[PDB]
Swiss-Prot record, chain B:
GO biological process assignments: cytoplasmic translation; ribosomal large subunit assembly
This protein's encoding gene: rplW
Organism annotation: Escherichia coli (strain K12)
Keywords from the named record: Ribonucleoprotein, Ribosomal protein, RNA-binding, rRNA-binding
Annotated PROSITE patterns: RIBOSOMAL_L23
Lineage of the organism: Bacteria, Pseudomonadati, Pseudomonadota, Gammaproteobacteria, Enterobacterales
Chain's role: One of the early assembly proteins, it binds 23S rRNA; is essential for growth. One of the proteins that surround the polypeptide exit tunnel on the outside of the subunit. Acts as the docking site for trigger factor for Ffh binding to the ribosome (SRP54) and to nascent polypeptide chains.
Transmembrane intervals: none
GO cellular component term, pick one: cytoplasm
Similarity annotation: Belongs to the universal ribosomal protein uL23 family.
Molecular function as annotated in GO: rRNA binding; structural constituent of ribosome
Official protein name in the record: Large ribosomal subunit protein uL23
Signal peptide: none
Amino acid sequence: MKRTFQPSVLKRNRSHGFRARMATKNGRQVLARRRAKGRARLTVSK
Amino acid sequence: MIREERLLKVLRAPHVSEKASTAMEKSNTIVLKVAKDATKAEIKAAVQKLFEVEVEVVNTLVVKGKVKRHGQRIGRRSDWKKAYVTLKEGQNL
Amino acid sequence: AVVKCKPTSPGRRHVVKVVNPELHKGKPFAPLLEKNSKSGGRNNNGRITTRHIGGGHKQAYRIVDFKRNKDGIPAVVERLEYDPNRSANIALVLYKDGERRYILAPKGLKAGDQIQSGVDAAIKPGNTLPMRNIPVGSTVHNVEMKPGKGGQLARSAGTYVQIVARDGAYVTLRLRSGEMRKVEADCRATLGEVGNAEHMLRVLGKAGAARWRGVRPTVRGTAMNPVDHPHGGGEGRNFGKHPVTPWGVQTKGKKTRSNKRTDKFIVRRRS
RNA sequence: GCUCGCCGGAAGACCAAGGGUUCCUGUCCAACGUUAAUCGGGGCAGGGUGAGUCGACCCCUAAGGCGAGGCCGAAAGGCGUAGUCGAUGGGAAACAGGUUAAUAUUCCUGUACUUGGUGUUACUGCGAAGGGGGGACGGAGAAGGCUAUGUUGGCCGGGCGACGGUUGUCCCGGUUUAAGCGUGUAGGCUGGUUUUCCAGGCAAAUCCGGAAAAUCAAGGCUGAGGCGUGAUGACGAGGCACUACGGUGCUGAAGCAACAAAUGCCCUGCUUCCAGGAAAAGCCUCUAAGCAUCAGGUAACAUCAAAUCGUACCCCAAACCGACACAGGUGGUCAGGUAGAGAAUACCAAGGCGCUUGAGAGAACUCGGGUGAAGGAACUAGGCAAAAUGGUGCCGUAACUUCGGGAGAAGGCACGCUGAUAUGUAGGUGAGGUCCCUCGCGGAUGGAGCUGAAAUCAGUCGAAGAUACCAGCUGGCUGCAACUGUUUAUUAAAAACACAGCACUGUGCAAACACGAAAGUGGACGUAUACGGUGUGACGCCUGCCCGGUGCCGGAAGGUUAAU
RNA sequence: AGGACCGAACCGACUAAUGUUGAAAAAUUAGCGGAUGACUUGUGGCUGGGGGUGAAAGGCCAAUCAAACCGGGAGAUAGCU
């Protein structure tokens, strides 16, 4: 059956990637919480 | 021209294997590990000027590093670059 | 020429076509075409603002000359063409100085026919000229509402506007609505009536024909749940309410004009 | 290794996405593998991915994103012009053969092609975020010409055969060759050329558009395939010499023709139909500012450059998405034989597999199937399930009907094999020869050869000739819904939703209406034959009475009536 | 010609049986509907929570939907267990 995760790298990055978190106020606050929690990978880039 | 300070840092090791060996003893090509940011003009110039031979053409691939592990600790090795340096008819090394 | 299709396969049983042998079978004139991307009924916020729109055939826009600015230069009608963006047909015309333009095609106008815009134009169908020079009681289409702006009244097929008065700087116009409106008399207008009247006689025949003009289905309000439409719910068919829009405003009677700026120009509302 | 079975429009082959070393070799069997394991997609180590031509990057753009200024907004921020990004689309160029354990249009051999830089030489008006062309583009249908590919004959090499026969109307195998370059064909489109003039293409224009003449009747554009060359080369069934028996080298015959034939190519064509079918760059042209014995343009030759990243391997799957080595999901490409209308179906080729627990026994019972005396719905909520029907041709076919249907109504008959008509016909294709020449990829004649239905007559076999697989059960009365469609992903597919059609009502354009603190945007580059809302729901005959209540529309006299 | 007819791919999901600590958190097998269209599909884009989208089922919005998920107010409150 066709499950929910149908992967695509270009949609992974355009959607949840770094240049797209940095592109706005609230994604920068996301990166700030991931750095402050102290996190090995911030976004999902590769 | 390429400066000689750049041109010394490019070639890194001769690559020893059996594909390399049959490339030397069968098709004049010496195979050698180069700098990761080394272009084909740099490798050609560096073999022209550091082994004093005449290079016909260079072919460069980039080899991806293998994820090994020690114990239960993984790690990728490291990517390197391998240059197939096709020499002319007059060569030794 | 309207044609009833023979009833092979339902779906064709009720279709009436409006065929026109004088339309150009071929490609339109290219440098008066441009891209017309379809929207889906959705504004710059992405949201559906006008419902029921979407799909349909790909269409190219045709720059139709509504202004009719080339004054005094005659133009022969080169051909007539199908325009997908309108109810009427468009005539491709060729001015004497070698410029082609598309105009709305009036009623009698065929290929090889002289039209002429401007003040000293002859009064005959196809000639755009200001309404201080048109006689009272003449059918007139493609009417401007502000001088220099372009035609906006009576553009849809088979539609005309009658000039009934010339009191001063204004002409009283019986719009196709039935409404009497004052327009400034310097506004150009094209003589005759616009010419595909039989457009209204076609009957479409099946559901997919509506679909291919870009008209998605209309779910009626009473078939929904109360969360969706004010008509909603009820254990079999159940109306019981005064009929409203999906936003609660009364349909079936309730007047929704509020302008106050253009009420000066309305002599009598429609009836 | 020999047999046996399974897939073969896939369970073969090649990719994209996705994964990321799973690829290949050596080595180990702890754990992982639903068992054992010497094996493995497991552990450990080593190896492996070679590009001017493939793809990305790059040039150009769609939807859409972002957006200097800007308009807007308590702030955050919204929208958006110039612009700038964004492929799933447009834009230069390589093919055959060989090779590795593992890469190959990348390496090697042979033969090519493309775009830029620079230099020389000959001629020369060049020049844009500007003008024009072009790129540039729908659905369906129909043939015609081809090819891939296949079949048969010829040729060449080999065999004459475990059991009757098999020197022949016999058996097995091979019969392959590309890009590029040259020619220009079956088609398809368009009249061509010269001169003058002009309110158009923001300016200019020799370009485009337009208006006059004059002359010629042809020119041009495009185009599959074939043919020639590439190629006296490669490949080639097989033999020969050594053989770490794994193979390794050497040598190597024929290498043709006929017919059939695509869903591929001519074809972005042609015919037709409404529902009227991207953009921008490369490309070709025109000039403006400027530069004008310079620069630049064109042509030939030479020379240099073409960087960077991807390239392993799986990819309908044990490697991706499904927690699993999961009976599920996953886009594109190639598509052989026989029978067949066919990409169905049966059996097969190439190729790949036998599904990572086995050995027995042959109880009840469960699951998947086969058959069944007589009866034949008696079962049951209900013919649920099963059984039955099932092909092609011809005959024949009712009520009712919107005249289309109903209709494949219903119901029948024929069907294999052999021989003759006819040492294979009708038809298709069509050589050599002959005739003419505007002479060749020509047309006329001619029929050799190949292919080849279908029908009749005669005979013969079986219980049965649509023999397997595949492949309608039919009829009568009636409710609802007109019809095709849509819907409760995962107990409801329906009479419900939709629908064409009808009506009412709003809406005069800065439209009503909707999203939006606003700007703005959709409505719509539309304009009342249009658009929005509401109900009803093809079609036919129709749609009666009630305005007291609630709503809406209209009226303005009087009563009451806020801020002030 | 056709929201035409029969029928594979392709899309679907009408019936039955199995399965129901499944091979599978919705499938398999045998039949079944559509199959040139209101079709189907790939790649990208857009719409967002009292909001979207809806041929309307209160369906769908990441195995979640009469108001998603995450985090916080937050140790809500619980005359109840």
